[PDB]
Design a protein around this ligand. Structure first.
Ligand SMILES: CCCCCCCCCCCCCC(=O)O
Ligand SMILES: CCCCCCCCCCCCCC(=O)O
Lengths: 190, 184
């Protein structure tokens, strides 16, 4: 596939500008200059500020979804899958500060295009966990989906607490605590 | 009267959403004049915050009462999860206003101060004889509250595909035994 290196450079700068300034104050002139290109060159890659914003959101969502699916699809047992998938989520939120704000701390949810890019994403990650959990479980499929929702919720909320509290314990202790809790439940917390 | 107005305002806010909801519609559905509504609430925002506060208090009081029990840890988990699913069924409007709300720092704080108080309680129970670093104990309490809420929201949003009792037991069993006990 032909690599549009100028597109990727633009998405990187646009991610920072949108997060740092907010959607309203962010401008195409600011984004072009940050990338070191003229505004007409920016328009040869993106049609509008909204199409660029949606491409930025899509890039961060794709990175999260692909990271999670790669964890689920490149492991052979339940426990291993849990370890690698929890790790992948902590890695995403720690390593993609822009992606984290755009997906999880987003105010600009007033328009359907943005809200859809997040709601289709969350459901796809839950679908994947559900596919793995339901297989040879003997569970009613709705109970299996309920568990997948709970498992994703428990993992996301633990990770978000850790990041939002400015990493009060090491990343390793947070990952270990989250995995141990997801695997053994409250019965094995002590 | 105030309580009667909070009940009608809750229905108007749910039916129309915050932005489309109007003080004239709220006064009309309560069978009072608009000036009478204003003798109890200063603005649509003050009324909305009072509505959210009432529903949050009902939920929080139900959850803390469940956590007050001097039984075992799993029994307390069971009574608290039951109390949350019960809140969704007996106060459906409250559940929608707190958890399925499209609509600002005043609103977010009324939900955040609530969530933090319930997490404080779960943390107090979890930290007692676990030997955990307090931040790890709080992290687990956050996860436990989060998964319970998310399981219950799935069940409601999917139009109760299984009975409330089966949903409570499934949520409790997952919270207690974790993924290690899901096939069993
Ligand atoms: C919004 C994206 C959330 C990503 C959450 C990733 C971690 C959840 C744990 C997944 C475990 C898969 C199930 C299994 O191991 O059987
Ligand atoms: C934000 C709404 C709060 C919903 C509360 C759901 C139940 C939480 C689980 C409580 C578990 C108690 C643990 C224990 O006894 O060790």
């Amino acid at each position: 596939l032909p690599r549009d290196e100028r597109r990727g450079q633009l998405l990187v700068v646009a991610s920072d500008v949108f997060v740092d300034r907010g959607y309203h104050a962010a401008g195409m002139d600011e984004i072009a200059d940050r990338a070191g290109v003229s505004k007409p060159v920016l328009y040869q890659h993106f049609s509008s500020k909204l199409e660029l914003y949606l491409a930025v959101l899509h890039r961060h969502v794709e990175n999260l979804v692909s990271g999670v699916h790669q964890a689920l699809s490149t492991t052979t047992d339940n426990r291993q899958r849990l370890h690698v998938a929890v790790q992948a989520f902590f890695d995403f939120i720690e390593h993609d500060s822009q992606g984290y704000r755009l997906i999880f701390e987003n105010d600009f949810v007033t328009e359907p295009e943005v809200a859809a890019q997040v709601r289709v994403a969350t459901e796809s990650c839950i679908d994947a966990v559900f596919a793995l959990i339901s297989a040879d479980s003997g569970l009613d499929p709705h109970r299996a989906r309920m568990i997948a929702v709970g498992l994703v919720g428990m993992s996301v909320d633990c990770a978000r607490y850790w990041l939002d509290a400015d990493k009060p314990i090491s990343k390793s202790d947070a990952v270990e605590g989250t995995v141990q809790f997801a695997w053994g439940g409250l019965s094995h917390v002590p």
